């Protein structure tokens, strides 16, 4: 299993994989109880009022001031039972993802994607960037710095606004300069979204109530794909967007969708990024990897005593799949770069995960959400690592009957309809 | 991010 411990939220802290921690939000905060479910990966069963100090209010603004696709509930994830269920739900989803060859590949890439040690101001020394760490309270009450790659945390005010968040740098654009940074994914396994089986209905903002439910493992995988891009510092600048001209409803509102999202979904959506611009990005990141190779060559000493210089050099030699010559100099091989870049951007896509999970899912990112449902994937009678909602040897096994909210209505509670609100 |  990906997670070797079936944690309970109430398990006593041990200062190792169950501990109170603080994140580098450049601000103050009370320690929060977190769980390390795998090497380099932690889960914080709390609403995210930490990564952004300006987003500490969970209370919903006045009803006359709320947008379209959003859902508020300041009480969600405030009790121990909810946190226990959150932890178990997120864990089950990691196992579902890991059970597929593609998920195993993606998770392996994420674990190997340690954020680059580029915090030193002296190019002859390698130093870790402290915002890619968390401070863990040890048994003696002292804090120890631990590097990590991924943190799954509860959503902020808008419960359904799932997304990757990471701490930036004063000058370096960590998610776009090949370096990478610790990723905090705002996510919840307790809600899911409804979509429509007919393409003409799903991509229309005036039709459909959301008959089918998105499998939450796909939603998490989508975020993990973004995390992968960001951990390897190859995320596409959000200012690079596709001025949608394939959907009259998007067009009439001048809606734009970032290339990063189209790339992440994959399938035909990825084709909206023309060859010229795609080549531009590839060359850009190829160069970024070259800088990392050179920075490693200029490194003559390492800061800290946790790991040795040769160890960290090998860590990044493996992450970026660099080549080493006779003198021990590092360099980027075009074939290996192209292979890794392609793996992270074309192999790991939402569309491909749908093929592995054998579930029904939106056919394109360019659609309109229909509704949000409350769910509970923790009980095996509701959802399993192997079949998600479509339980084998039951009436829900075929035709995605488990995702059919009308047939499997006992597993879904519609909280809000979005159709017509655009 | 999920999107529209
Ligand atoms: Zn996204």
- Domains of chain A: which residue ranges? 1-422
Residues 6 or more apart from A51 whose CB is under 8 A from it? A23, A25, A153, A165, A167, A184, A186
Rg (CA), chain B: 4
For residue A331, what is the enclosing H or E element?
strand A330-331
CA distance A254 to A245: 9
What is the number of other CB atoms lying within 10 angstroms of the CB of residue A359? 21
Evaluate whether A94 touches A100 at the Cβ level (below 8 Å): no
Q: Tell me the nearest-neighbour CA distance from A250 into chain B, angstroms.
A: 9
Residue with tokens 């990691």: A94
Q: Length of chain B, please?
A: 4
Q: What 8-state DSSP symbol labels residue A315? A: H
Q: What is the 3-state secondary structure (H, E, C) of A364-395?
A: CCCCCCCEEEECCCCCCCCCECCCECCCCCCC
**Percentages (nearest 5) of helix, strand, coil residues in chain A:** 30, 20, 50
For residue A403, what is the enclosing H or E element?
none
Q: What 8-state DSSP symbol labels residue A267? A: G
Solved using: X-ray
CA distance A65 to A332: 51
Evaluate whether A44 touches A156 at the Cβ level (below 8 Å): no
- Give me the residue from A161, A163, A369 closest to B4, CB to CB: A369
Q: Classify residue A160 as left (phi > 0), alpha (psi -120 to 50) or beta.
A: alpha
Q: Which residues on neighbouring strands pair with residue A183, listed in sequence order? A: A150
CA distance A331 to A30: 44
Chain A positions touching B4 (Cβ under 8 A) are 69, 250, 255, 366-369, 422
Strands A256-258 and A301-302: unpaired
Structure-token pair, residue A90: 């997120």
Q: Which of A393, A323, A293, A346 is nearest to A106 (CA)?
A: A346
Evaluate whether A330 touches A323 at the Cβ level (below 8 Å): yes
Evaluate whether A124 touches A298 at the Cβ level (below 8 Å): yes
Q: What is the separation of C-alpha A303 from the centre of its chain, rounded to a whole number of angstroms?
A: 30
Residues 6 or more apart from A204 whose CB is under 8 A from it? A249, A368
CA distance A106 to A68: 33
Evaluate whether A367 touches A285 at the Cβ level (below 8 Å): no
Q: What is the separation of C-alpha A305 from the centre of its chain, rounded to a whole number of angstroms?
A: 31
Q: Classify residue A287 as left (phi > 0), alpha (psi -120 to 50) or beta.
A: alpha
Strands A413-417 and A371-374: antiparallel
Compute CA distances A146 → A22, A150, A375, whole Å. Answer: 11, 12, 34
Which residue of the set A223, A280, A318, A324 is catalytic?
Answer: A223
Q: Tell me the nearest-neighbour CA distance from A183 into chain B, angstroms.
A: 13
CATH architecture of A1-422: Alpha-Beta Complex (3.90)
- Give me the residue from A164, A261, A422 closest to B3, CB to CB: A261
Q: Which residues on neighbouring strands pair with residue A413, listed in sequence order? A: A374
The answer to whether A232 contacts chain B (CB < 8 Å) is no
CA distance A157 to A66: 11
Q: Which residues on neighbouring strands pair with residue A331, listed in sequence order? A: A323
Q: Which of A294, A273, A287 is nearest to A345 (CA)?
A: A273
Give the relative orientation of helices A80-98 and A216-231 as an angle to the nearest 10 degrees: 70
DSSP A30-88: --EEEEEEETTEEEEEEE--SS-GGG---S---GGG--SS--B-TTTT-SHHHHHHHHH
Residue A200 is among the residues annotated as catalytic for this protein: no
The answer to whether A160 contacts chain B (CB < 8 Å) is yes
Evaluate whether A209 touches A419 at the Cβ level (below 8 Å): yes
Residue with tokens 């510092």: A233
Q: What is the separation of C-alpha A381 from the centre of its chain, rounded to a whole number of angstroms?
A: 27
Residues 6 or more apart from A7 whose CB is under 8 A from it? A18, A35, A37, A87, A88, A91
Structure-token pair, residue A374: 């409350």
CA distance A259 to A139: 46
What phi and psi values does residue A77 have, to the nearest 5 degrees? 65, 40
Residue ranges of E strands in A78-196: 125-126, 133-137, 143-147, 150-154, 163-165, 183-186, 191-195
Compute CA distances A313 → A210, A308, A309, A410, whole Å. Answer: 50, 9, 6, 53
Q: Which residues on neighbouring strands pair with residue A242, listed in sequence order? A: A257
What is the number of other CB atoms lying within 10 angstroms of the CB of residue A218? 23
Q: Is A357 helix (H, G, I), strand (E, B) or coil?
A: helix
What phi and psi values does residue A336 have, to the nearest 5 degrees? -70, -40
CA distance A357 to A140: 45
Contact yes or no for A193 and B2 at CB 8 A: yes
What is the number of other CB atoms lying within 10 angstroms of the CB of residue A305? 6
Chain A positions touching B2 (Cβ under 8 A) are 160-162, 193, 219, 222, 369
Structure-token pair, residue A334: 């075009």
Compute CA distances A147 → A5, A40, A41, A129, whole Å. Answer: 20, 7, 10, 9
Structure-token pair, residue A393: 């040897």
């Amino acid at each position: 299993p990906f997670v070797n411990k079936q944690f309970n939220y109430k398990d006593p802290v041990n200062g190792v994989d169950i501990a109170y921690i603080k994140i580098p939000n450049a601000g103050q905060m009370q320690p929060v109880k977190a769980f390390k479910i795998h090497n380099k990966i932690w889960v914080i069963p709390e609403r995210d009022t930490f990564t952004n100090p300006e987003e500490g209010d969970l209370n919903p603004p006045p009803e006359a001031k709320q947008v379209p696709v959003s859902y508020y509930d300041s009480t969600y994830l405030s009790t121990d039972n909810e946190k226990d269920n959150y932890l178990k739900g997120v864990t089950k989803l990691f196992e579902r993802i890991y059970s597929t060859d593609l998920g195993r590949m993606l998770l392996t890439s994420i674990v190997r994607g340690i954020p680059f040690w580029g915090g030193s101001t002296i190019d002859t020394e390698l130093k870790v960037i402290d915002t890619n760490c968390i401070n863990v309270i040890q048994p003696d009450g002292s804090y120890r710095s631990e590097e990590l790659n991924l943190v799954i945390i509860g959503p902020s005010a808008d419960i359904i606004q799932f997304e990757c968040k990471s701490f930036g740098h004063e000058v370096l654009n960590l998610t776009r300069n090949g370096y990478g940074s610790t990723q905090y994914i705002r996510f919840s396994p307790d809600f899911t979204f409804g979509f429509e089986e007919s393409l003409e209905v799903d991509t229309n903002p005036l039709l459909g109530a959301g008959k089918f439910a998105t499998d939450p493992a796909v939603t998490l995988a989508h975020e993990l794909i973004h995390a992968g891009h960001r951990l390897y510092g190859i995320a596409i600048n959000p200012n690079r967007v596709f001025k949608v001209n394939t959907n009259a409803y998007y067009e009439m509102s001048g809606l734009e969708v970032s290339f990063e999202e189209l790339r992440t979904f994959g399938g035909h959506d990825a084709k909206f990024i023309d060859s010229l611009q795609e080549n531009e990005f590839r060359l850009y990141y190829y160069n970024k990897f070259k800088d990392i190779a050179s920075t490693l060559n200029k490194a003559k000493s390492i800061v800290g005593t946790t790991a040795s210089l040769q160890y960290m050099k090998n860590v990044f030699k493996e992450k970026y799949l660099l080549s080493e010559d006779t003198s021990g100099k590092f360099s980027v091989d075009k074939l290996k770069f192209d292979k890794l870049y392609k793996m992270l951007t074309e192999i790991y896509t939402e569309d491909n995960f749908v093929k592995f999970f054998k579930v029904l899912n939106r056919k394109t990112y360019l659609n309109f959400d229909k509704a949000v449902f409350k769910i509970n994937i923790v009980p095996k009678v509701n959802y399993t690592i192997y079949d998600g909602f479509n339980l084998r040897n039951t009436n829900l096994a075929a035709n995605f009957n488990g995702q059919n909210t009308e047939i499997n209505n006992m597993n879904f509670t519609k909280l809000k309809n979005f159709t017509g609100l655009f | 991010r999920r999107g529209m």
